[PDB]
Design a protein around this nucleic acid. Structure first.
Ligand SMILES: [Mg+2]
Ligand SMILES: [Mg+2]
Lengths: 38, 111, 191, 130, 292
RNA sequence: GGACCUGGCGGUGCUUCAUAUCCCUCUAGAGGAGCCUGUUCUGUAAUCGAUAAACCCCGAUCAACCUCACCACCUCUUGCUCAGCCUAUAUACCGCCAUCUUAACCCUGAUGAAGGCUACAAAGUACGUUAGGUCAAGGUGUAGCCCAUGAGGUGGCAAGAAAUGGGCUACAUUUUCUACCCCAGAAAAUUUAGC
């Protein structure tokens, strides 16, 4: 990370880390905290 | 009850602050919940009468589960000890179980 | 086996039954509480086997009697506010500088929060011994950190990782600002 | 316990140090939750504790926030607030009160405690350097 | 189906649980009431579920259980009521009573009771036509010179239409340090938010953010909007307004200020004038905002 | 063969109305101009080709002597690592879209088939399918090539016509420039959508 940054300096539901289908499945069951569908 | 009663009639099984505004680590908590539910359902096969309740206060992790009275109490105690220790060393946090035995499935209605 | 609620007297010591935060136990709670949207010509579901009552963060371990009996024992850990400081008028007189710092309580394995390092120092310039030139220089030097309406200078430090380091940085910033405001350069002559 | 009672109890050791105590002008405890009933119950608990410990408390309700996001299938998140300003409390009283109310923080509720300590000017700044 | 023994037991458990809850809350069980039950259950078991019936409840078993069982004859077999064999003894007894009162009179905001709750009162299923006949008899009784017993009898069968929308909240009249009476109110239009203070006496001076209204609102449309409230109730030039508006644009700010002034002016006008303003749309928040 | 009962009419026409989708009604475009372009045809030994992979140096933009694909000549090999391959198969399966097929009782008729309503009341009450598409925001397998479906050198490959579809620009007097953020001065038919 540091090494690659140094040279450069000189010059879907990824929010929850779930598959987009799965987030629906979890949220419908009420499993996610505070995710109420409206 | 249908999903559109999650805040009207139904509730939330898992309860954590991570998803709130400004709070972090929501995805981490969700991944922990996924594994925890799989591991409970596999460590108590055909025993859980209804879904778990995964509460978290501070670093605590309460699994308030509801099971049946079909297995012997010795097996329940052994599984409680095993799963508690396994999860406490899994997440490096003080996990705990609150099994609630019921005579049978508590049916609400019929669909 | 029979629930132990049958053995509980009507004059029991409830705090001993729920000493700490514990989930709803229908075999331990001696209440005929029901909850659930009733079906047609039906009643709300009973407590035994109710997952919805198990989902509530119940306050059974915190009853008024329990709260009083706890905070009566916790009095030994307290000190007394200095009676001389009767109102904010004397607080802004005897203790000019106000240091604001924040702590965050989330739920998880990690207690770290990146926002707990911020420190905010607030001091009224009228409490500092600055002459006319000194106050002019300090105000022009700080810029927007000084609010003319309130006469307050607000120095917010968050550069350092920890909080003690940010507090020390804020103190050092105030120290320099004062000393370099009380200094006139050869350049400063011809304003 | 009708007869069998503990004869004596080990009170915890609280030693009065010599170092002077910290003084807090204000202490704002902002509690955030997905449920208004939990926040109301926690408000009652915290207020009762504050009255009994002699701390001066004032409660209000900052505005609720809503996060709406669509994946059509639409989801929503509620964030409700309750702000408890304690005033004119020393370091030890504030510390013990916070320990109590944070150990008794209900499920799904986070806290943001802002402490405004009172301090004096450094002796370096009392007079200019000569 | 709930047997009477079951309900008896549940009454017993409710009573013991009531004393238990009274012990837990520290209140005196002797005077502990149902409102106390509701409040204590709400505190102990917090629930923000919107459906009030989905929240925790500990009610007296009489209100929860729909168990009903009425015996119509004794051990000897003789029915208690003289109209038993009609099969609708309650309904026909009521009709008989109404007809008797009508005979006696002949010798000398609210709604009618709806069919289902009439059945509930009678505890007997009845059709549409017999309900219509009963309502016709009640109307005939009203037409005659009903005396006391008659009109409380009819009032037994008339519910209350509690939908009176004339419930605008009249702001209390406050007094400034100079002793002048005034009233403060708020208003909102789109993102514009306004707060107006209307004085009881004035010369028609409106100050918007400390600026005269003709200078703050160059466009005549906004000035007409500011006119609309006072002109509608014939008091132009009789009040002073000091308002503060923030956010939104020219038209949104004008509308918010109009709403605020109307709501503050409600204090100094009559109830009839308040209703006239309400029917003119001067006291309703406009809910139309930008859509996603 | 006489009389009667239930019908069904996969029914057929009219009459009256409910008569919403869709027209008509309203608003703004599109027909002009200049470019780049998709398709089709014809051409060459060759490919007209593709830049999470070139060039740029206001904005953009063409080949670039690029590069992978292609044509014609060749070369490397036990080699990278028991190597290597942007090969095939959903005509292998799931995943996802789309096609099509698809109760009791009581009365009446002489106890016949059978029938039972009037409110100012007269018997009525209780899944499969497909040589389907999609392996670009998803997976599990199955086979191919392995002195070549792998790795390299040399050169070559530049394309034209219409008929149609789309995209990018400016298109003004209710305009434009300055000061201001609204009382100033100067200039000059078809057809697609929506409510
Ligand atoms: Mg296929
Ligand atoms: Mg070419």
């Amino acid at each position: 990370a540091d090494e690659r940054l140094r040279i450069n300096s000189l010059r879907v539901k990824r929010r929850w880390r779930l598959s987009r289908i799965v987030f629906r499945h979890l949220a419908d069951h009420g499993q996610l905290s505070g995710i109420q569908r409206a | 009850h249908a999903p559109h009663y999650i805040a009207h009639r139904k509730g939330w099984l898992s309860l954590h602050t991570g998803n709130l505004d400004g709070e972090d680590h929501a995805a981490e908590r969700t991944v922990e919940d996924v594994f925890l539910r799989k591991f409970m359902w596999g460590t108590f096969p055909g025993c859980l009468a209804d879904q778990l309740v995964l509460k978290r206060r501070g670093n605590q992790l309460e699994i308030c589960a509801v099971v049946l009275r079909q297995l012997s109490p010795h097996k329940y105690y052994f599984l409680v000890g095993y799963s508690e220790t396994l999860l406490s060393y899994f997440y490096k946090c003080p996990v705990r179980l609150h099994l609630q035995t019921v005579p049978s499935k508590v049916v609400y209605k019929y669909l | 086996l029979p629930p132990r609620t049958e053995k509980m007297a009507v004059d029991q010591d409830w705090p001993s039954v729920y000493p700490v935060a514990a989930p709803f136990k229908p075999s331990a709670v001696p209440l005929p509480v029901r909850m659930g949207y009733p079906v047609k010509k039906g009643v709300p579901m009973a407590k035994e086997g109710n997952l919805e009552l198990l989902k509530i963060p119940n306050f059974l371990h915190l009853t008024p009697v329990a709260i009083k009996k706890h905070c009566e024992a916790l009095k030994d850990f307290c000190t007394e506010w200095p009676a001389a400081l009767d109102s904010d008028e004397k607080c802004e007189k005897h203790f000019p500088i106000e240091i604001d710092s924040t702590d965050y309580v989330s739920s998880g394995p990690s207690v770290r929060n990146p926002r707990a390092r911020v420190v905010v120092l607030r001091v009224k310039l009228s409490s500092l011994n600055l002459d006319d030139h000194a106050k002019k220089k300090l105000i022009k030097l700080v810029g927007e950190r000084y609010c003319k309406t309130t006469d307050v200078l607000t120095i917010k430090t968050d550069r350092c990782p920890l909080r003690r380091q940010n507090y020390d940085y804020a103190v050092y910033l105030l120290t320099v600002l004062y000393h370099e405001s009380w200094n006139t350069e050869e350049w400063e002559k011809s304003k | 316990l009708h007869v069998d009672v503990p004869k004596d109890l080990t009170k915890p050791v609280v030693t009065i140090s010599d170092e002077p105590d910290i003084l807090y002008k204000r202490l704002s405890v902002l509690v955030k939750g997905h449920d208004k009933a939990v926040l109301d119950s926690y408000e009652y608990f915290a207020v009762l504790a504050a009255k009994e410990l002699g701390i001066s408390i004032k409660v209000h309700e900052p505005p609720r926030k809503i996060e709406r996001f669509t994946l059509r299938v639409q989801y929503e998140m509620r964030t409700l607030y309750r702000c408890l300003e304690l005033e004119h409390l020393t370091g030890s009283t504030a510390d013990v009160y916070l320990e109590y109310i944070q150990r008794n923080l209900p499920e799904g509720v986070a806290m943001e405690v802002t402490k405004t300590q009172l301090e004096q000017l450094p002796e370096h700044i009392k007079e200019p350097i000569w | 189906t709930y047997t009477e023994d079951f309900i008896k037991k549940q009454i017993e458990e409710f009573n013991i649980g009531k004393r238990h809850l009274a012990n837990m809350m520290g209140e005196d069980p002797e005077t502990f009431t149902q409102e106390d039950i509701d409040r204590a259950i709400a505190y102990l078991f917090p629930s923000g579920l919107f459906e009030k019936r989905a929240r925790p409840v500990m009610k007296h078993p009489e209100q929860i259980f729909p168990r009903q069982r009425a015996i119509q004859w004794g051990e000897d077999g003789r029915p208690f009521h003289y109209l038993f064999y009609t099969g609708k003894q309650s309904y026909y007894s009521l009709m008989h009573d109404v007809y008797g009162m009508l005979l006696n009179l002949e010798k000398h905001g609210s709604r009618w009771l709806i069919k289902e709750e009439l059945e509930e009162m009678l505890v007997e299923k009845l059709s549409d036509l017999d309900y219509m006949q009963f309502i016709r008899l009640l109307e005939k009784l009203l037409t005659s010179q009903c005396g006391a017993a008659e009109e409380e009898f009819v009032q037994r069968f008339r519910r209350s239409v509690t939908l009176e929308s004339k419930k605008q909240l009249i702001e209390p009249v406050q007094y400034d340090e100079q002793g002048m009476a005034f009233s403060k109110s708020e208003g909102k239009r789109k993102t514009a938010k306004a707060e107006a203070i209307v004085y009881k006496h004035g010369s028609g001076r409106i100050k918007v953010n400390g600026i005269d209204y003709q200078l703050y609102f160059p466009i005549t449309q906004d000035r007409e909007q500011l006119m609309f409230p006072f002109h509608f109730v014939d008091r132009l030039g009789k009040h002073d307004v000091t308002c503060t508006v923030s956010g939104g644009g020219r038209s949104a700010q004008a509308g918010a200020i109009r709403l605020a002034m109307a709501k503050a002016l409600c204090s100094f006008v009559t109830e009839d004038e308040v209703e006239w303003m309400r029917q003119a749309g001067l006291l309703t928040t406009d809910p139309r905002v930008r859509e996603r």
